[PDB]
Structure formats: C-alpha cells, structure tokens
Amino acid sequence: KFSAKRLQTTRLGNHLEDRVNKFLRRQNHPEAGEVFVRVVASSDKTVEVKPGMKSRFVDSGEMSESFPYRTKALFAFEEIDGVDVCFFGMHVQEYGSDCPPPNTRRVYISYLDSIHFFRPRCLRTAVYHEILIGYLEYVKKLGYVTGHIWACPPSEGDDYIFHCHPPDQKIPKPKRLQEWFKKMLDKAFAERIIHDYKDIFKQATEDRLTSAKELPYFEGDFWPNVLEESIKESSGSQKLYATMEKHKEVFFVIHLHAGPVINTLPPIVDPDPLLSCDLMDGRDAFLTLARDKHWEFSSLRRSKWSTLCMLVELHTQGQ
Numbered sequence: 513k514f515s516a517k518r519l520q521t522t523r524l525g526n527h528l529e530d531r532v533n534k535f536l537r538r539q540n541h542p543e544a545g546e547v548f549v550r551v552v553a554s555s556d557k558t559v560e561v562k563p564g565m566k567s568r569f570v571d572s573g574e575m576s577e578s579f580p581y582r583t584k585a586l587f588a589f590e591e592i593d594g595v596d597v598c599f600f601g602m603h604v605q606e607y608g609s610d611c612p613p614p615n616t617r618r619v620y621i622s623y624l625d626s627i628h629f630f631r632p633r634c635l636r637t638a639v640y641h642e643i644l645i646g647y648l649e650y651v652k653k654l655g656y657v658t659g660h661i662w663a664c665p666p667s668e669g670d671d672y673i674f675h676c677h678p679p680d681q682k683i684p685k686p687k688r689l690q691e692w693f694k695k696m697l698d699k700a701f702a703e704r705i706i707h708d709y710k711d712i713f714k715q716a717t718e719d720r721l722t723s724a725k726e727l728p729y730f731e732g733d734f735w736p737n738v739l740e741e742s743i744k745e746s747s748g749s750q751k752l753y754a755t756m757e758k759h760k761e762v763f764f765v766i767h768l769h770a771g772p773v774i775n776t777l778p779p780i781v782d783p784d785p786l787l788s789c790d791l792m793d794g795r796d797a798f799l800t801l802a803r804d805k806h807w808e809f810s811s812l813r814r815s816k817w818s819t820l821c822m823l824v825e826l827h828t829q830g831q
C-alpha cells in the first residue's frame with residue numbers, strides 16, 4: 513500500500529502530526545479527517561558565501577567561507593473521501609550547534625506552500641499554524657535558539673512547491689502574509705513556546721550589528737543577494753540598516769530560547785536519520801516532474817490523483 517500513513521515516520525513528523533491531530537480532536541467539526549505529517553527528505557548541505565561577501569570578509573578571515581546545514585522537506589496529508597490529499601509542504605534549513613557564527617543554532621523556513629482543500633475550511637489556517645508552531649516547538653526542544661521567516665508570496669503564476677494551484681485559491685499579498693505569521697507567532701508566544709519575535713531591523717539594532725558579516729547567511733534567503741548588490745554598488749552597515757528598516761515587516765526573527773539558559777544548552781543532535789530522496793531535494797525536482805507528467809493541484813480530483821502519483825514516487829524512489 514502506498515498511503516501517506518505508510519511513508520516512513522520520524523520524530524519530527526510525528527511531533528507535528530500529534531500536535532495537529534490533538535488540535536483537531538479538540539474541535540467540534542465532523543468533517544475533519546486525520547492528518548499525516550511526513551518528513552520525506554533530509555540531507556546535509558553547505559551554503560557558500562557569494563563572491564562579493566567572500567572577497568570582503570572571507571578572504572580577510574572575518575567570516576567562514578561556508579555554513580553547513582541540514583535541510584528537510586515535510587508534507588501534510590489529509591484523508592478526504594477515504595483517499596490521501598497532500599495539502600501542505602515546507603522546506604527548512606537547520607544550522608546546528610557546530611555551525612560557525614553567525615548561523616549557530618538557527619533554523620530558516622526556505623519555502624512553504626499549500627493547496628486549499630483541507631476539510632473543514634474553517635480549520636485550514638489553524639492547522640497550518642499548528643504545523644508551524646509544532647516545528648518551532650520541536651527544534652526549540654532539540655536546542656535551536658532562533659528561527660527565521662521571510663514572508664514572501666510567490667510571483668504571479670509561480671508555484672513554490674505544488675504545481676498548478678486552484679484558480680480560486682487566492683495568493684496573499686505581503687501584508688496579509690505578515691499578519692498571518694504574526695497570528696501564528698502570537699499563538700506560539702501565548703503557549704510559552706517562543707520567548708519573543710522581532711522584525712529584523714529591531715533585532716539588528718538590539719544586537720548592535722555593525723557589520724554585514726554578522727548577519728545570518730542562509731541559502732536562497734533575501735540577505736545574501738542584498739549584500740552582493742551592495743558590494744557591486746560600492747558604510748556598508750548604514751545601507752544594510754536602511755534596507756532592513758525599509759523591509760522590516762516581512763522579516764521575522766523568532767527566539768525559541770532567551771537569557772542565560774542559552775549558555776547551558778547541550779549539543780544539538782538530530783534523533784532522525786537522513787533520508788535520501790532526490791525527488792524532494794529542493795523544490796525544482798518535484799515541480800519539474802509534475803509539470804512534465806501533468807500532475808496539477810488545481811482541483812480536489814486532480815489533487816487526489818497527483819497525491820497518489822507523488823506517493824507512489826516517494827515509496828519507490830528506493831525500490
């Protein structure tokens with residue numbers, strides 16, 4: 513059987529799944545089926561400091577030439593009409609306790625995407641928020657300290673993870689998306705999971721940032737390219753602050769631990785093994801496969817069959 517339930521379980525996936533399904537059992541809605549959360553890819557990578565920042569800070573010995581990270585792809589499936597429907601996907605980057613500064617003990621959400629067929633609709637957002645809260649709660653427990661989110665909707669007609677969204681699935685503008693993250697993080701705060709969250713500009717000020725080399729440097733994040741442009745343009749710190757302030761509302765810095773307890777945390781050890789899966793190594797592979805195979809997520813029926821196809825591929829990549 514090629515169900516989503518039969519995809520390999522992990523501590524991470526199970527923690528998210530248990531959180532979602534406990535939330536759903538506290539709601540009085542008949543329609544809500546059981547949710548499965550599966551980590552489907554997990555591999556170790558490095559992000560290299562791009563040439564401008566490398567010449568300024570790596571060649572002078574002020575900044576590590578690259579940063580190691582674990583990246584993971586996870587997906588959420590709902591039983592709908594007795595048949596799995598993938599409705600949520602997310603990629604994360606995790607910079608562990610051995611990672612050189614400035615990235616040490618930080619997580620970054622590379623990408624998040626969704627297809628709006630969760631039943632019931634009135635619980636869809638709450639379920640997305642619970643998946644994200646669960647993720648923060650989980651990496652906090654392993655000893656990560658700071659999480660990072662860039663609230664950036666896709667360009668028009670573009671897809672982050674799932675090929676071909678429904679035509680009536682509206683795409684939030686950045687303001688709506690910031691507010692969506694604030695509501696999620698406000699709930700995380702109320703549950704005493706996160707200590708605080710701040711926009712990037714306020715955080716940099718309180719951190720007394722004076723050099724671009726102090727900014728966490730993540731793969732595909734906004735800031736590495738900003739820094740490459742400012743070096744081609746040629747007080748780098750004064751510009752950086754002006755850019756951070758200008759876009760501050762869209763960059764979230766989330767603190768999972770605060771205060772002197774940070775100084776006591778043991779090494780971070782991922783209890784889950786790595787999972788080799790070329791299909792879900794980054795976003796382009798699955799997007800390409802679906803485009804070529806005409807797997808769309810644009811109606812419930814097409815999402816059902818595309819989920820079936822995605823599941824058969826994930827179960828047999830290792831055959």
Ligand SMILES: CC(=O)N[C@H](CCCCNC(=O)CSCCNC(=O)CCNC(=O)[C@H](O)C(C)(C)COP(=O)(O)OP(=O)(O)OC[C@H]1O[C@@H](n2cnc3c(N)ncnc32)[C@H](O)[C@@H]1OP(=O)(O)O)C(N)=O
Nearest residue numbers: 622623624625626637640662663664665666682683684685
């Ligand atoms: C730039 C660069 O260099 N590089 C970038 C890389 C940047 C880094 C990427 N950053 C991230 O990954 C984290 S930010 C999230 C960005 N990902 C996406 O946005 C994927 C598409 N969006 C979605 O899947 C969902 O909207 C989701 C974000 C999961 C929220 O779903 P939801 O359902 O809980 O809330 P709702 O969507 O607001 O809808 C909730 C209500 O709001 C409605 N609504 C939504 N949008 C609109 C709208 N525009 N106008 C009017 N109403 C609107 C909506 O219809 C609804 O109504 P109802 O509940 O009555 O039906 C690059 N690689 O391109």
